[PDB]
Design an enzyme around this catalytic site. Structure first.
Site, short mmCIF file in Angstrom:
data_model
loop_
_atom_site.label_atom_id
_atom_site.label_comp_id
_atom_site.label_asym_id
_atom_site.label_seq_id
_atom_site.Cartn_x
_atom_site.Cartn_y
_atom_site.Cartn_z
N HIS A 116 52.14 40.02 36.99
CA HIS A 116 52.44 39.05 38.06
C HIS A 116 53.25 37.83 37.54
O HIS A 116 54.15 37.34 38.22
CB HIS A 116 51.18 38.57 38.76
CG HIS A 116 51.44 37.56 39.82
ND1 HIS A 116 51.22 37.82 41.16
CD2 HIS A 116 51.89 36.28 39.75
CE1 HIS A 116 51.59 36.76 41.87
NE2 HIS A 116 52.01 35.82 41.05
N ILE A 151 44.81 43.91 39.66
CA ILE A 151 43.43 44.38 40.04
C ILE A 151 43.44 45.44 41.16
O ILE A 151 42.65 46.40 41.15
CB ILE A 151 42.53 43.16 40.49
CG1 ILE A 151 42.44 42.08 39.40
CG2 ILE A 151 41.06 43.59 41.10
CD1 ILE A 151 41.97 42.56 37.95
N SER A 152 44.26 45.28 42.18
CA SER A 152 44.03 46.08 43.38
C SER A 152 45.33 46.67 43.96
O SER A 152 46.49 46.29 43.59
CB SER A 152 43.25 45.27 44.44
OG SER A 152 44.14 44.55 45.29
N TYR A 153 45.14 47.59 44.88
CA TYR A 153 46.28 47.99 45.75
C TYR A 153 46.55 46.92 46.82
O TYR A 153 46.17 47.07 48.00
CB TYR A 153 46.09 49.36 46.38
CG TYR A 153 46.33 50.54 45.46
CD1 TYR A 153 47.61 50.85 44.96
CD2 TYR A 153 45.27 51.36 45.10
CE1 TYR A 153 47.82 51.95 44.09
CE2 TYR A 153 45.46 52.44 44.26
CZ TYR A 153 46.73 52.75 43.78
OH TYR A 153 46.87 53.84 42.97
N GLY A 154 47.21 45.83 46.42
CA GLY A 154 47.66 44.86 47.39
C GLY A 154 49.15 44.88 47.65
O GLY A 154 49.83 45.80 47.31
N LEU A 155 49.64 43.80 48.21
CA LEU A 155 51.04 43.68 48.48
C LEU A 155 51.91 43.86 47.21
O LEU A 155 52.89 44.59 47.26
CB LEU A 155 51.26 42.32 49.15
CG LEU A 155 50.62 42.11 50.55
CD1 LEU A 155 50.82 40.76 51.11
CD2 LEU A 155 51.18 43.11 51.54
#
Lengths: 125, 126
Positions: A10, A69-73
């Protein structure tokens, strides 16, 4: 065979983030598990972008790992768009200027991250 | 043996998968028996529960608050300590929050477990 890794992060306004990516880069490169290891970014127009890391690498297969961490945008949209790869969840096997490229799943669900949480208390190593 | 708790503090997402990841980490550690209590909380964009509410729900001597974040960024050095009334900045932080001992631990980023998690997104063991 020659296997590549690109770590895609990120980034942050504060320096610690890039420094952490470089730490994993160096640890993984010195292990020898892959022939080439690079970092890239998938937010805020940060550089290098995944395409710039991939274009520099001369590998028969390159794995792109979302340091997220996650399946986000960022993972289901920003990262695939950056590679011209399909949006949504799951591992994605694709070709990129004639190289084979596989985006992996985000790290979030892994038991090693459960352990990293535990080890933020236990401080072993 | 002291009464120990864990609060895992995450970023969250407009998509659903972050909350389920948090839930999965909570559930794994709860079943392991390592801590007397485990709760989740959030430290971005007014997400709930906030850390203060998770802690107030806990019946513990010491609460370790663990940032689920790669780095000491704005969320770790600003949001998380502001939400706890602790001073901003880098590093571990130990004090009290409404009478309970609270240790804001280091974010997981630099752990060797994160390097191995990166390796396992490729190798996919387990």
């Amino acid at each position: 065979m020659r296997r590549g890794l690109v770590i895609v992060g990120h980034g942050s306004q504060l320096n610690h983030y890039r420094e952490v990516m470089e730490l994993h880069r160096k640890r993984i490169e010195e292990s020898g598990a892959f022939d080439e290891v690079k970092i890239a970014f998938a937010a805020r127009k940060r550089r290098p972008m995944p395409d710039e890391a991939i274009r520099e690498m001369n590998c028969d297969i390159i794995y792109v790992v979302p340091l997220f961490i996650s399946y986000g945008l960022h993972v289901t949209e920003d990262l695939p768009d950056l590679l011209g790869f399909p949006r949504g969840r799951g591992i994605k096997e694709g070709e990129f200027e004639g190289k084979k490229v596989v985006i992996c799943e985000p790290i979030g669900e892994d038991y090693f991250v459960t352990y990293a949480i535990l080890n933020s208390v236990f401080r072993i190593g």
